[PDB]
């Protein structure tokens, strides 16, 4: 009996890197076509079989401050708390892992530039759910909100992750228990019926198929939170790694990639429209994207599309374009790099940011194309 037999069907055009469990990204030519990634193209990252959930018997378990347990149905989650909408980009820590393997092979799913997508999410504020359970605005010291998914190891251990309590309770942090995605109910692959969405934070923490929410003095003790998605020095390998030396990724650094044109393409002479995305963690706005055609020697400023968000709440990626003249029979190396609102920047090369897990791959994206005659 195959544990994945009950997995949902998917859109045919996806770049699949794993069938069981299912991991896929949209083609790069469609990735940044729209500001909001259609649900069918939104990248999918699963560690386990997809839970099959009967909507009416579903209960979200929320542990209260004193040890008691609140049990919430989907209907109650919909009706008791004012629905809030947050447009937010999820990026996997493993995004662009494949460029890291080009330096030296790494463990992990070989993501290209598409382990990132954007949706308008709708649901209960996590803040409101915790206050209803009885928690105060503020706990003394460093507390965490731990989540468990309905998906578990063969031995019983569920997918688990956590965020700091401060972020959970913050109105401005926009943390949702989402049951809607781009205006329709959550797809199975994306957490039906309920997922956490943590804006400005690595995808790992946005726990799908939510079964439990608990408040703890410690972060999630799940092996996913303890052993994955941490960043190490380039000198560290599997025989020397000590998971305690690096913190769980929460906010991600500034990131950008070229979606148009594609590597190895032949483009017509005259004008070329270069397109891509840019994004940064922690609600930090993209203030600028620089684009080079000559391998990063000279730069021009891209046009940033779409609308400004409030300060500290730039949860959604900025899409960018730049139309440039191109000469017949030349070689272009197209490079992009982004600058965020704290003026963080992307580093020149991959090797100095290499790590055994292939996470945190934010060096300049480089695309080599030729111009036709």
Ligand X SMILES: Nc1nc2c(c(=O)[nH]1)N[C@H]1C(S)=C(S)[C@@H](COP(=O)(O)O)O[C@H]1N2
Question: Which residues contact ligand X by CB under 6 A?
Answer: 42-48, 90, 92, 149, 151, 159, 190, 203-204, 206-209
21 touching a second copy, by CB under 8 A: no
* Sequence-ordered list of residues with C-beta below 8 angstroms from that of 364, at least 6 positions apart, any chain: 296, 335, 336, 337, 346, 347, 348, 349
- Write the interaction track for a second copy spanning residues 134-173; mark x where CB under 8 A is met and - where it is not: --------x---------------------x-x-------
Residues in the chain whose C lies over 2.5 Å from the next residue's N (breaks after) = none
CB 42 within 8 A of CB 26: yes
- Write the interaction track for Mo ion spanning residues 6-45; mark x where CB under 5 A is met and - where it is not: ---------------------------------------x
| Residue bearing tokens 């020149």 | 348
The count of chain residues that interact with Mo ion, using the rule CB under 5 A, is 4
Task: Report, in Å, the least distance between residue 242 CB and a second copy.
Answer: 11
Task: Report, in Å, the least distance between residue 208 CB and ligand X.
Answer: 4
Q: Which one, 124 or 204, has the nearer CB to ligand X? A: 204
206 touching a second copy, by CB under 8 A: no
CA distances from 349 to 100, 346, 364, 366 (A): 10, 9, 7, 10
Query: Could you tell me whether strands 365-371 and 266-267 are parallel, antiparallel, or unpaired per DSSP bridges?
Result: parallel
The answer on whether 207 is annotated among ligand-binding residues is yes
- Which stretch in 117-125, 163-171, 196-204, 302-310 sits in contact with Mo ion by CB under 5 A? 196-204
- Written as six digits, the tokens of 236 are 């560290």
Distance of CA 300 to the CA centre of its chain: 28
The answer on whether 350 is annotated among ligand-binding residues is no
204 touching Mo ion, by CB under 5 A: yes
- Which stretch in 7-15, 88-96, 174-182, 296-304 sits in contact with Mo ion by CB under 5 A? 88-96
- Which stretch in 15-23, 24-32, 217-225, 351-359 sits in contact with a second copy by CB under 8 A? 351-359
The count of chain residues that interact with a second copy, using the rule CB under 8 A, is 45
Collapse the DSSP code of 48 into the 3-class scheme (helix H, G, I; strand E, B; otherwise coil) and give the result: coil
The answer on whether 206 is annotated among ligand-binding residues is yes
The secondary structure of residue 293, as a DSSP letter, is S
- Write the interaction track for a second copy spanning residues 301-330; mark x where CB under 8 A is met and - where it is not: x--------xxx------------------
Q: By C-alpha distance, which of 246, 67, 224 is closest to 148? A: 224
Q: Where are the beta strands (DSSP E) in 37-191?
A: 44-45, 59-63, 69-73, 84-91, 116-125, 144-152, 158-164, 176-181, 184-185
Task: Report, in Å, the least distance between residue 297 CB and a second copy.
Answer: 8
Largest CA distance in the chain: 74
Please provide the distance, in angstroms rounded to a whole number, between the alpha carbons at the two ends of the chain: 57
CA atoms of 75 and 56, how far apart (whole Å): 8
CA atoms of 303 and 300, how far apart (whole Å): 10
Helices (H), 213-290: 223-227
Task: Report, in Å, the least distance between residue 252 CB and a second copy.
Answer: 7
Task: Cite the annotated binding site for Mo-molybdopterin by residue number.
Answer: 43-47, 92, 151, 190, 195, 206-208
Residues that bind a second copy (CB under 8 A): 142, 164, 166, 231, 233-235, 246-247, 249-254, 281-282, 287-288, 290, 296-301, 310-312, 337, 339, 341-349, 351-353, 360, 362
Residues that bind Mo ion (CB under 5 A): 45, 92, 203-204
């Amino acid at each position: 009996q195959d544990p994945f037999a009950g997995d949902p069907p998917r859109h045919p055009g996806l770049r699949v890197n794993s069938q069981k469990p299912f991991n896929a990204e949209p083609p790069a030519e469609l990735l940044a076509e729209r500001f909001l990634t259609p649900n069918e193209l939104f990248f999918t990252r699963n560690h386990l079989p997809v839970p099959a959930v009967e909507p009416s018997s579903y209960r979200l378990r929320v542990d209260g401050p004193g040890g008691g347990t609140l049990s919430l149905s989907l209907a109650e989650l919909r009706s008791r708390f004012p629905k809030h909408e947050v447009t937010a980009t999820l990026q996997c820590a493993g995004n662009r892992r494949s460029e890291m393997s080009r330096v030296r092979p790494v463990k992990g799913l070989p993501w290209d530039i598409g382990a990132i997508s954007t949706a308008r999410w709708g649901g209960a504020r996590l803040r409101d759910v915790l206050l209803h359970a009885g928690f105060p605005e503020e706990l003394q010291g460093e507390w965490h909100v731990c989540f468990e998914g309905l998906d578990a190891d063969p031995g019983g251990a569920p997918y688990g992750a956590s965020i700091p309590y401060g972020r959970a309770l913050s109105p401005a942090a926009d943390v949702l228990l989402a049951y809607e995605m781009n205006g329709t109910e959550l797809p199975r692959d994306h957490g039906f019926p309920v997922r956490v969405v943590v804006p400005g934070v690595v995808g790992a923490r946005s726990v799908k198929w939510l079964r439990r929410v608990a408040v703890s003095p410690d972060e999630s003790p799940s092996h996913w939170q303890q052993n994955d998605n941490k960043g190490f020095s380039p000198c560290v390998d599997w025989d020397t790694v000590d998971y305690r030396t690096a913190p769980a990724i929460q906010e991600l650094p500034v990131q950008s990639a070229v979606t148009q044109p594609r590597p190895g393409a032949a483009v017509p002479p005259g004008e070329l429209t270069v397109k891509g995305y840019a994004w940064s963690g922690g609600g930090r706005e993209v203030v600028r994207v620089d684009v080079s055609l000559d391998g990063g020697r000279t730069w021009k400023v891209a046009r940033l599309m779409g609308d400004k968000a409030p300060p500290g709440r730039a949860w959604a990626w900025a899409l960018w374009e730049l139309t440039v003249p191109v000469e017949a029979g030349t070689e272009l190396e197209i490079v992009c790099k982004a600058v965020d609102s704290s003026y963080n920047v992307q580093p020149d090369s991959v090797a100095p940011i290499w790590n055994l897990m292939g996470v945190l791959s934010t060096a300049w994206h480089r695309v080599r194309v030729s111009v036709q005659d």
